[PDB]
């Protein structure tokens, strides 16, 4: 299943210089192994994944609390948003590339 608990951003989405972005997320819940709901979208009303995910299928491997996970993403050139989570506690981070 997917991690239905909210995440905390440990650091701001950084630039690697490889045309990709990197952000480290902390998982609050202890729901066991679950998939990380992260995607790159063009707008906040149509979650079309316009950005390829470099880190192949990010995962929360351990079944404990406060597990940090590193995720790498390639956003499209121009305006874009980085969405982490689902529901009302979904955090949207506007990113701009080159």
């Amino acid at each position: 299943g997917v991690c239905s608990k909210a995440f905390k951003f440990l650091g701001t989405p950084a630039d690697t210089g490889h045309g990709t972005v990197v952000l480290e997320l902390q998982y609050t819940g202890t729901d066991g192994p679950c998939k990380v709901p992260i995607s790159s979208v063009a707008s906040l009303n149509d979650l079309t994944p316009v950005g390829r995910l470099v880190t192949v299928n990010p995962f929360v491997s351990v079944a404990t609390a406060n597990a940090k996970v590193l995720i790498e993403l390639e956003p499209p050139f121009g305006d874009s948003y980085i969405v982490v989570g689902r529901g009302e506690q979904q955090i949207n981070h506007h990113w701009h590339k080159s």
Partner: antibody
Amino acid sequence: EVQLLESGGRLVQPGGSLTLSCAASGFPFSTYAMSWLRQAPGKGLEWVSGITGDSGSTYYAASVKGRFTISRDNSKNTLYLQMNSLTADDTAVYYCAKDRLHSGLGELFSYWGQGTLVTVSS
Amino acid sequence: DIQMTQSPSTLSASVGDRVNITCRASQSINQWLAWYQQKPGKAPKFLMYKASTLETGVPSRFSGSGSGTEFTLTISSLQPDDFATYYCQHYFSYPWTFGQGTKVEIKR
């Protein structure tokens, strides 16, 4: 605009089974999470179950885990609630509810149907 | 399981009064609180989320405040269209929980 029509509520004997349906119109049902809720006659509201719309995650109240099952048919815009092992404390009006945001977890309920009446008695 | 508690359970007011309805939580909920309205023989109506943000279409005489563990819904000019029972609901943890409800009654 939005219309949620519940049907399937009736009288069933304790230990029996019953399936609820909820036909939806007026919004992109495929992209919105739905929820079943119940209100006992003259009592407060109670959340029962929710489903993501992508049918990727389901959630149930403690008193219904193992007894109830939530599902949906996106091609028919219909929400389902399979109920088994119905006790007397399951007698309530069961409501159909639409999530506020799309692609959500059913965290809240922005529109309700008129609800259907389920009676568990001998 | 967060338990929601509303106070009072019944208040009697006249058309035009300003009314407060308190809703408290057993744990700390930052602002993940919603408000619902229900008239008798009718389905509930979603009024507010985030404890302060009005749902679209809701009159501006409704307002909310509170954070953490105590919240209040406010009706700044009580209209006949507002006398009903009001429920608060949290969306902090998995088991979404409602309050007891609070019946606003016409005083005569």
